[PDB]
Symmetry: C3
Subunit: 288 residues, 3 copies
């Protein structure tokens, strides 16, 4: 195996190009960079700009006003002697129930969310087409789902190894000033760098892609590294992480789940996502 | 915001005093000290006395006889080369299925439990009244619930940051001989000391208060710190932690849950506590 | 209490010998070594031989071909700059859906699995008989279940303290060249060594034995230690861990569960294993 993380143009895939390369990428790697999907650096920088201003310059009171009463990191702001936000701050959003610091932030972030949600649906549609997969209930009902967007600022592991439990996850990063590459994934049994690319988004396949396709798609393990010390000046970083997550009522075959590695304890022949994961979303999982 | 942790007299709240102060405390802080609730230092010391004697002087055989066959810390004693109890010992009780080292311990601990359970119900009734909340099924059925009391001796973080998943949690501590203040909570985005007060109990609102009230009550994050070394002589401590926990069949609105931050994966319009958390109680949660 | 970990011959127990000793062992310890159960060192070495050859000498491509697309450690190979397998490698199997590196490996490992599954059922039948226990639905339907076998190579804690959630767990180890004893369990409130025995398998009772027997069987806590440094040359080791796990539909009394320490949040009077643990198997649990 070439252990190179590939790149695909969404526009080209949608035109039927690179069918074998894409399908083998999904089976053997389960991650790739995606160009030509409507996600520019320019917009990343505009959404990034307005939230970073809020993180640095918003007051305790303004933060409070967009903090959920339970600290779940589902919507709004999460700071996370001193503060939980010493380590990192988060801003989360979905298709509704959002908490916005102002009308300007709302306009920018709604647009950014919608662009990520469209791209995510679109790449997912290609993963399903590439694998000949018709979800129970059909493709469009499956993709009209329960996305979660989290943007996270890290001051100068960071994140332990895990796989995602999404259909797909779209990641936009900003680079470390000092060049350190924090995001890593297992490819060919070894940890491969996943650097910022100004022209592309990183796609990880998650365990729901494995499930829905009957095991035709790998859900790779990945983690976020921390610098040496030679590299701990200018080591701060941000990431925009978009989880395309199924509806609670997403239904699948139990015997099929078993065949691809899922250690289910489910009686009978079909089950729902809620049956499997329970009554709260679980976005990530460790192999341990 | 004043980030002072307030104190309320339960007797005064029950007479309708400090309505605005209490309601704003619940919304903006979700914790407070409570006086005038039937919980003296004297009784803490009497229950504390008899269990500490058991911890230090009870034999392996006497410990065994009040240890559950599965090490869940639900009832009885939990020790928790050498032993799991090197780090800490626990004594747990509920409204039934209790394991008591003797008739004297049973009398003292039953009375102590009942006083904490009454106070917990009583403060919870005030939180519900303050927020205009009628639980599905009514107030009294909601409060006749599944409490758990755990008393824990810590030898000289200790507890990672979390919020509780109770309606309310009542905490009585004994101080460190050397003055160190181990319990901390986020208030105004910063870690505030929560010291022993001889005349008062500390109340944390938990995520069930947030849920049942439709988001009118904050569930604060809190953690237990460890000394410096200048403060690691005389750093042992004890805490009595009373979780007022809903019945499995406690029913709530799914859309309402979503509106206040709960990242539910629940199909349809109502759900039960068992639907949400699953078939075992989960007492605490991290934001991570 | 004698805190010696006892040994029983399965053949003798099946003939009705040592009834009191066995029953008191289950109640007070919940672990023992088992001889005369069809599990030789010779076979351990033959299954061990062929998998260790695969771990050291199988290629990336051959590993890939027996790796599940989701990294669950349910079937096949789990490696677990550099690799997740730097720390340890795993090989997992069940009664079906297995992934085998070759016809020779398959023959050897199928036979090894079957021998462990037979021994596990057989010792479990004795635990149930010793405690006068008839599972809902009868003994044989209960024991025709969902086993999982994991073989794990550890290079030179390792495993945090936990109890198992199996009916029983059978452990075959190979020793450290340097004599260090990694596996430890709580017996008499203290950590007792559990060394390799060439003629015997180690049996841990799990929480399902506690549950099904109404609390007549202890589920002990255990952990895997790491050497000093004087003992970190020749500290690598392997273990074969067989979990005899109930069917999803295993049914028990909720009030009875409560009586023995299980902190269930289950409405009504009976429940299933799936109700209690959820839709994925959970093999181990910490007291924390
Ligand atoms: C590696 C990842 C793709 S998944 C991981 C992590 N996951 C989350 O925050 C997610 N659990 C979350 C969303 C909303 C509320 C609570 C929590 C995240 O972000 N990391 C991404 C990254 O580092 O690139
Ligand atoms: C911060 C807290 C209010 S909640 C936290 C912790 N929680 C538990 O022990 C509880 N999970 C438990 C009860 C019974 C059986 C198993 C476990 C506890 O005690 N700490 C309190 C404290 O330190 O003041
Ligand atoms: C102490 C133990 C008896 S249980 C513990 C651990 N558990 C597992 O690997 C098990 N969770 C597993 C099986 C399959 C897929 C995912 C995970 C294991 O192995 N250790 C044994 C040991 O060290 O002797
Ligand atoms: Fe991830
Ligand atoms: Fe707590
Ligand atoms: Fe174990």
């Amino acid at each position: 195996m070439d252990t190179t993380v590939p790149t695909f143009s969404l526009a080209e895939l949608q035109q039927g190009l690179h069918q074998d390369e894409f399908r083998r990428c999904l089976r053997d790697k389960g991650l790739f960079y995606l160009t030509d999907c409507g996600l520019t650096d320019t917009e990343l920088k505009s959404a990034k700009d307005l939230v970073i201003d809020f993180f640095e310059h918003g007051s305790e009171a303004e933060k409070r006003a967009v903090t959920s009463p339970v600290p779940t990191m589902r919507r709004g702001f999460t700071g996370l002697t001193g503060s939980y936000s010493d380590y990192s701050m988060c801003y989360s959003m979905g298709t509704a129930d959002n908490l916005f610091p102002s009308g300007d932030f709302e306009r920018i972030w709604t647009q950014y969310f919608d662009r990520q949600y469209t791209a995510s649906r679109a790449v997912a549609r290609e993963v399903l087409r590439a694998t000949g997969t018709e979800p129970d209930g059909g493709v469009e009902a499956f993709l009209d789902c329960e996305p979660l967007l989290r943007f996270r600022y890290f001051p100068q592991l960071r994140m332990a190894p895990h796989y995602d439990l999404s259909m797909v996850t779209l990641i936009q990063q900003t680079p470390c000033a000092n060049g350190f590459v924090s995001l890593q994934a297992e490819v060919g049994g070894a940890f491969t760098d996943l650097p910022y690319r100004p022209d592309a988004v990183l796609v990880f396949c998650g365990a729901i892609a494995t499930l829905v396709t009957g095991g035709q798609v790998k859900a790779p393990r990945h983690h976020v590294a921390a610098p040496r010390r030679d590299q701990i000046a200018g080591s701060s970083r941000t990431s925009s992480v978009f989880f395309l997550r199924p509806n609670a009522d997403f239904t699948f075959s139990v015997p099929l789940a078993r065949e691809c590695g899922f250690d289910v304890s489910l009686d009978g022949e079909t089950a729902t996502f809620q049956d499997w994961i329970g009554g709260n979303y679980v976005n990530i999982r460790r192999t341990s």
